[PDB]
Symmetry: C2
Subunit: 281 residues, 2 copies
């Protein structure tokens, strides 16, 4: 198993689906260009990869979950487009490239966020988004459950709640944990859970995957804080060494949540967890 | 015969109960919940939920089957207002005599409140427990998927948002004016009746007739608004049907839209279709 090759092939496939989801030749042009600019501006596609890998680990075909992989990346992008607004965060650049509101203006950026959010649901709900070999009997209820999970992870019980609390703005540990679980972990949770649902996973499998996702979700942000402090965060509260220990515990917990799966089949998730833990950027 | 004012009153009451119940009163992210509740429960005549419930009724379903979607469309409607009122967009400080969401809660909270309402509409329509126990367990999932797709479609770059983007781009030709109105007004009306009909177990033929009904009354609404403005910010404000057509041709067009709306419903039980017929009349002959 070659993880870099895996990440490359999944990111390539996901970018293809994303590019195909938005026409570059229809009005209004500014909207479609803003959407494609925001969505096709590269990215490691970690959330779509989690989705496909969770579909695979429960015994599904990855193509069954491709619309959802695309959807969670649309949702992630939307969250970036809105977080970057001058009223919030106020970022002119992302990586080395100017943000959506810089290129297209704030009105177009707000609207681009809304259209991406809408598109995620539209794309996941079209039966023609899925391959012809889906289970015709079971698939509709799976789609409903997945839509419910994505929506639940985005709103006042997930992403937006975290954004709101982070906006209110030293922060106690419980509140920091809240913000990270909602602003970061919720959408990872949705990625793997939706993947497992569409793959036909059992409730038992889905709940193990959910616990895995919550651990790597927190881990993602703890490692983010650690890297940012080396270049309110967990090291500001607990110190760098306790932060590293906590990260270690989260990684170990996540890997342990998969002990019920065939470890060959769970290799992508195991490797994804490693990847999340050991980033250096 | 039929008392439209009473009908609107009972449906608005029922919808308001569902909406109030959709968002917790004291759940931990309080500012957000309060803001959502403020935006969503600040009155309104609830025409879109009523369209949804009436469409479920006319195809032979129970109105309760469509209540979650009714709630959902009002959330989407609210979301659009919340985002439209923003200073970078329409810059409105008041909406129907009440301070807008961003005035009371600030711009960040208004943007996020919009986002949260949009997601709540889908969350709410997808929960199996949102629906009454007597739904068809075999067919209901595929209907919910289809309705969710229609709802999403009416929001994004093929509907509401496309219309707002175009309306912002700033005299306008008739094609662009109708484009703007079809996307900013008709799309969500169409989604309301289409979703209602889907969840009600309506046929493809019934669904498409209701869709055309909604397109016609959506256009009719904006045409009548322009006429009333003559008898009594954006591209659709500056450019009007009477400026393009003259007042008399505008009135003729309104009459044609009304007759079309009424004809789209000719295949339904006219008693069950009463709320829709009377709604079309209300839209055509109102004076404000």
């Amino acid at each position: 198993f070659d993880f870099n090759a895996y990440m490359g092939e999944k990111a390539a496939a996901v970018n293809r689906a994303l590019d195909a989801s938005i026409p570059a030749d229809e009005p209004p042009a500014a909207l479609h260009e803003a959407m494609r600019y925001a969505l096709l501006a590269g990215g490691k596609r970690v959330r779509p990869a989690l989705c496909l890998a969770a579909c695979a680990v429960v015994g599904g075909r990855e193509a069954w979950a491709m619309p959802a992989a695309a959807a969670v990346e649309m949702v992630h992008t939307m969250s970036l487009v809105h977080d970057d607004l001058p009223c919030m965060d106020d970022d002119d650049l992302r990586r080395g490239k100017p943000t959506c509101h810089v290129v297209y203006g704030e009105p177009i950026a707000v609207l681009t966020g809304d259209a991406l959010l809408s598109l995620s649901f539209h794309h996941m709900a079209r039966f023609d988004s899925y391959p012809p070999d889906i289970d015709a009997d079971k698939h509709p209820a799976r789609v409903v459950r997945a839509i419910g999970e994505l929506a639940r992870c985005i709103g006042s019980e997930g992403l937006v709640a975290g954004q709101v609390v982070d906006l209110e703005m030293t922060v106690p540990l419980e509140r920091l944990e809240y913000i990270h679980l909602h602003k970061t972990a919720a959408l990872l949770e949705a990625s793997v859970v939706i993947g497992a649902i569409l793959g036909g996973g059992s409730d038992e499998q889905i709940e193990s995957l959910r616990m895995y996702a919550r651990s790597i979700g927190l881990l993602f942000q703890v490692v983010d804080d650690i890297l940012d402090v080396t270049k309110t965060t967990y090291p500001k509260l607990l110190g760098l060494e306790k932060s590293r220990e906590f990260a270690e515990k989260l990684l170990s917990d996540a890997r342990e949540q998969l002990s019920g799966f065939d470890q060959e089949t769970a290799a992508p998730l195991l490797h994804l967890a490693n990847y999340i833990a050991y980033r250096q950027n």
